[PDB]
Every structure is written in C-alpha cells, then in structure tokens.
Design a protein around this nucleic acid. Structure first.
Lengths: 186, 50, 111, 56, 102, 123
RNA sequence: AAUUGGAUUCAACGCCGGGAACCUCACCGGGGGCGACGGCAGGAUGAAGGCCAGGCUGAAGGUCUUGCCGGACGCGCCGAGAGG
C-alpha cells in the first residue's frame, strides 16, 4: 500500500512467528528471534539457551519449523539459523520460561524462587525481582514477591533498561503466573 | 450403503444394459429412467426425455 | 380513485417497466435490482394456485416483497416469527410492503 | 441419513461479523483495520514488540 | 547518465540519519554529482486507544505514535555507480526506493 | 462365481496365495476389475484371462449361471475361501468378492502358470 | 413467542458494544443435520457423496414415492473425543 502501512505489516509479521515459537521452543529455552526479511528467503534467527533441542531429535524440528513458515508467509524458502543467546541468565524471558518448567514440575515456591534468584545474581544482575501471582495452592488471590538489589525506576527509561520475562507455568489444580524482572548493570 | 443394485440384465454368453445412455454428454453415463424425466449420474443434471 | 392504479386488470398487462412510474422509490428498487432465490420458488406457488399442478396454500417468510397486481386474490401465509398469519390481498394493497400486513409483535395493551 | 456439506453458507458480505482477528478469533470484539486486525486488548499486549511508543 | 532518486524512509530516528549521512559521504567522491539529503515530513501516525478492557469507571486512554520519516536524495550517476552506493548495511527497518529517469 | 458348497476341483493352499499375489501386481502395474456386478460382465464378453471367484456369494443372481458358462468360454476359474481374502489380494485393503484381471502387467510369468495348472485339472 | 447476557452506591447506568437490517448473536419459532480413536458385530451381493420429477418445504434430494451414476469402506452403541 504505502510507507506507513508496510512497516506495520512487517511488525505484525514479527508477532505471529514470535508467538508460536516461544510456545514450542520451551524445551530448547526460548529467548528471541532476529528476523531478517528479504525477497529471497525469510531468514529467522531463533534464540535459545540450547541449540540441540531446536534442531530436534535428528533434523525433525528444524524441518518442522521450516515447514510451518511456508504456510504463514509468501516466502516459501525460509532459512533456519540457531544463534545462542550469549547470557541466557541476563535474559529474563529465558528465566521466566525456565522458572515455568520448574513450577510445572511441582518444586516448592521459595526454593524454586531462591535458586533462580541465585543463578542470575551470580551471572551479573545489579538487581532482580520475581513475582508469582496466582492461586498459591489455596483459593485466595495473593502474589509472593522475591526481592533483591535495585529495581525499575520511574517513567519509561525505567522499562527499556531492565529485562522482563513472563510465562504461564501450567498446573492441574489451577494456574500460577510467572513474572521475572531482571535489572542488568547499566 | 444400499444393496441390491444388480440392474444389468444377463444373456447366455453376453451382457446387455437395462438403462439408457445419455444424449447430452457422450456414452459412459447412465440414466435414472423415470419414464419421462432423466437424472444424470456423473454429476447431477436436470434432463428431459429425447 | 377506487381500486389503486388505472384499473386492477391493466396493471397485470403492464408488469415490467410501466408500473415503475406509478410506484414509490422503495418498491421500484427491489423489483429493478431483482429479488433473491426464495422469491423464485414463490413464483411457482402463486402459479400452481391460479391454474394447473396441485396447489399448495402459499406460505412465505417474504416480508421485503411489495404487492403487485397479478398476486391480488390469493390468501398469503406470512410467518410472524412464531406462526403463519393470513392476509386476503386486495387492489388497495398495491404499493405497500407484504411484511406490513402480518404482525412483528403480538398485539396486547401495555401495563 | 445423507446430506451435503456445511461450514456456514449465508451472506456475510460486510460489517463486524465479516471480520476476525489474527490473535483471539472474534467477530464483534475489536478489529483494528490498518493491516493489523486484532482486538484492542491484544493490541495493548503486542505493541512494544511492534515498536509503538506509549508516550504521548 | 540517469538522474536517480533515492527515497529513503525509516520508522526510527537513529536508523534513518546514519544511512542518509553515509549515502552522502561515499557518493561524494567518484563519478557522482549529488544534491543534498533533504528531510520531508514525519507522517506521524496517531492511533488513539481505549486502555481498559472493561471500558469501566474512568478508563485511561493510550496515545500512540508511529512516526515515519522520509529523506530524499537526487543523484547523477550510472546504474552501476548506484549499486556501489547501495552496498551499505542499512538498519532492519529502512525502506530505500529507487526511481530511474534520464 | 462360487458358493461355500461348490467343490468341483481342488485349490491347494500354495496355488491360492500365488493367485492372491498375481492379482495384487495386476492392479498396481496394469488394469483390474472388482465388484461382482462389473466382473459378471468381464468373464462373459471375453475380457478376463483367468477368473478368480470367492466362495461366499448368496443371494444367487450371478452364482447359478457362471460355473456352467465359464467352461464354455475356455477360461479357468480358481477359488479363494473368502471376500476379505480376495479383497486384500485385489490390490486394495477393502473387499472384492469377485475380480477380473484384464491384462496381466508384471504378474505375466505367474498368471500363465496358474491358468494351465487349473485348466489341466478341470476349469 | 423471544425483547440474549453480564455490570449495580462512590468504583453499574454514551458500561463490555472502537459500529445489532441478514451477518453479528449468545434469544425465539419453525425446517433440516455432522459424533473422532480404540472394542465389539457389519463390508464390493456397488457409496458413505451427488441427483431429475411430483408429493412435501417460508427455501434445502431436505424429506418420501421413484429410478440411478462416479469409484471405492463405515453405522449402532460402549470407553472416550472435537465443539459449546
């Protein structure tokens, strides 16, 4: 159409592929998608803590990811690349997805909180927060707030500097919302 | 499903076809002969008797 | 002028085009653009009733048809939404909607 | 018995019932038509990845 | 020779200026006469939206900006002197249009 | 075709398997007929080389006339003891209480051996 | 006949509705209709799908009477799905 619409079209294109791939690549450890868009073959760069899951169990997942990409888009030769995230513990969205699995697993609240806090502070976190809104295994709507170091400030040069990762860790009695807000040194 | 549908008659060493063959399209398509009104078989066409 | 139009009969012989100059802006439009594939099966059941193959008592969900001169005489069954309410069609009904004559609510007092 | 297919076959030429989103699959709920058909509620969640800015 | 227009827009400020500056620096020295990188408008796009999904009480209402900025460049060079200058990396996310007339 | 009561000649368990498998290559290379109402026409015109007939057809309409008519056309017939055993054999994984191989294709070394061995004994 | 539902003091009442003539739509009246995957018995001795023509339907082989094709696999329940 014009200049204005196309940019928004592209950005809408980012979401439909970033939404699905997160939900699948929770086994890998999803952290991002650097999407390079061309008329030759859409080049998606999937970010994982671990590349050995994304490839698959023998080529299946990388081909599966090549095959659903043809359906959504009109570039029918989309490449796949796996780049590692360089610090997955500096990435919050990784820690949210990583914490979600552990609560899916059944490990206790403050324990499942402590380790997490401790692995990213070791990594280099000026400050960190984990919040867990949910049932908290009764039937009252209370969140538990695990707190160390600095935090998100005021305004918006608040939220740009910090990291923020959200994940619904499913249970079979209810649900628990996993928020992980990291503050990197800066 | 719907049995029985053996409507092709038998000669002694030959076969013959009971129903009519269409005159709008070519041979290969039989007519549900109503006596005045011909249905079609391949697809489903309103045809009148010629 | 008693009987609406020139005379009841001459408007059965003027049907396409010549009626139009007489009619409202709204009745013209739906004749001129045409009406739906359920309005084509209702031109068999007014025709089975005036002559020929065993007549059905004509029923309709047609409430967007505007009454013509040929259809004057038949007893038309217009579904109010629950049930069929009859209307004996007159020549004074040329130029009005068919969904006017059958109800769109049950008629009682308010309170 | 036997019958022919259905997947809906009525008019839906235009209006709200014509539209659906590409995230929560609705007719009557919001459809922002700029080539970004979503509801207002999705819109808010999605935008920081879009590159829209909160600031007035 | 063939007067080309590079019409270059971008959705963000930092990405558009670096390319406009680099395009005026590399083209400067070769077989190119180049007219300066002119800024046209920001067709700032306002999406003005209801926050609350209840639509209830007072609902605070988001103002949205999408700002798309357009630099324009005339150039007198060949179609071969054009690709040499279109080598550049370019931010994601920067649209570069090319009209060709004599 | 046949019934479970017609035993006029023997059909060994080694000659019925080769005729379940010389009818399976017959459909995936050449042409095959199946469904008894289309087969009751292919033995009679003279388009069938070797008929093979399953032993479960009853009601009789295409079962009273075809044991004495098929000895007059110069064609041998051979028994499968079921419709589900001639169906899997037909090419496909669904019934076929009668079949007529019009054209052996890659079954041709095996459909000339089974059609003289059954014609030797009794058609 | 149904006037779909929810919201209810501030903080429910231009509210969910940033779009109710059909659509939407969840309500009512009437006509018509899909139930996975396994088990069980059935199979090609021709459709599970299509179809003139009346008789019926507000219309739809939809339904019956009625006659039939293209090429070949699916009820009824019982666990238990998709859908809401």
């Amino acid at each position: 159409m014009a200049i204005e619409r196309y940019f928004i079209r592209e950005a809408v294109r980012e979401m439909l592929i970033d939404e699905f791939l997160e939900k699948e690549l929770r086994r890998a450890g999803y952290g991002g998608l650097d999407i390079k868009k061309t008329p030759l073959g859409t080049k998606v760069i999937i970010f994982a803590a671990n590349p050995g899951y994304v490839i698959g169990r023998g080529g299946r997942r990388i081909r599966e990811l090549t095959r659903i990409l043809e359906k959504q888009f009109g570039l029918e030769n989309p490449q796949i690349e796996v780049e590692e995230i360089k610090n997955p513990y500096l990435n919050a969205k990784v820690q949210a997805v990583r914490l979600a699995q552990a609560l899916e697993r059944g490990i206790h609240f403050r324990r499942a909180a402590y380790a997490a806090l401790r692995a990213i502070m070791n990594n280099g976190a000026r400050g960190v927060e984990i919040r867990l809104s949910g049932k908290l295994t009764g039937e009252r709507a209370k969140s538990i707030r695990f707190y160390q170091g600095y935090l998100a400030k005021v305004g918006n040069p608040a939220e740009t500097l910090v990291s923020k990762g959200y994940a619904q860790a499913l249970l079979k009695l209810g649900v628990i919302g996993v928020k992980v807000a990291i503050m990197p040194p800066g | 499903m719907g049995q029985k549908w053996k409507l092709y008659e038998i000669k002694d060493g030959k076969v013959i076809r009971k129903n009519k063959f269409c005159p709008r399209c070519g041979p290969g398509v039989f007519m549900a002969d109503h006596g005045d009104r011909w249905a079609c078989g391949k697809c489903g066409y309103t045809e009148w008797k010629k | 002028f008693r009987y609406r139009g020139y005379t009841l009969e001459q408007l059965m012989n003027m049907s396409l085009e010549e009626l139009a100059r007489l009619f409202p802006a709204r009745q013209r439009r739906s004749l001129k653009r045409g009406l739906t594939p359920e309005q084509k099966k209702l031109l068999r059941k007014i025709r089975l009733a005036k002559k020929g193959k065993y007549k059905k008592p004509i029923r309709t969900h047609c409430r967007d048809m505007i009454i013509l001169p040929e259809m004057v005489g038949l007893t038309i069954y217009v579904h109010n939404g629950k049930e069929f309410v009859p209307v004996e069609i007159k020549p004074e009904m040329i130029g009005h909607y068919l969904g006017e004559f059958a109800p769109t609510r049950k008629k009682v007092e308010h309170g | 018995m036997a019958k022919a297919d259905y997947n809906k076959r009525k008019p839906r030429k235009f209006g709200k019932g014509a539209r659906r989103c590409i995230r929560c699959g609705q007719y009557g709920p919001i459809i922002r038509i700029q080539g970004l058909m979503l509801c207002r509620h999705c819109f808010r969640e999605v935008a920081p990845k879009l590159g829209f800015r909160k600031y007035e | 020779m063939q007067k080309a227009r590079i019409k270059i827009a971008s959705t963000n400020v930092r990405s558009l200026d670096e390319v406009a500056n680099q395009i005026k620096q590399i083209a400067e020295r070769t077989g190119v006469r180049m007219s300066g990188p002119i800024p046209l408008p920001t067709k700032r796009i306002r999406i003005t939206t209801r926050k609350s999904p209840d639509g209830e009480g007072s609902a605070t209402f988001d103002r949205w900006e999408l700002r798309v900025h357009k630099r324009l460049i005339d150039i007198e060079a060949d179609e071969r002197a054009m690709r040499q200058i279109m080598r550049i990396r370019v931010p994601e996310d920067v649209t570069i249009e090319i009209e060709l007339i004599s | 075709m046949a019934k479970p009561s017609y035993v006029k000649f023997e059909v060994p368990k080694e000659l019925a398997e080769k005729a379940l498998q010389a009818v399976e290559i017959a459909r995936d290379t050449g042409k095959i007929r199946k469904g008894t109402n289309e087969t009751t026409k292919a033995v009679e015109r003279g388009q069938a080389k070797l008929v093979i007939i399953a032993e479960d057809v009853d009601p009789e309409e295409i079962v009273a006339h075809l044991p004495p008519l098929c000895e007059e056309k110069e064609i041998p017939y051979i028994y499968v003891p079921s419709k589900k055993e001639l169906g899997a054999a037909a090419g496909i994984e669904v019934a076929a209480a009668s079949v007529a191989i019009i054209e052996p294709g890659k079954a041709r070394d095996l459909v000339e051996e089974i059609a003289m061995k059954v014609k030797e004994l009794m058609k």
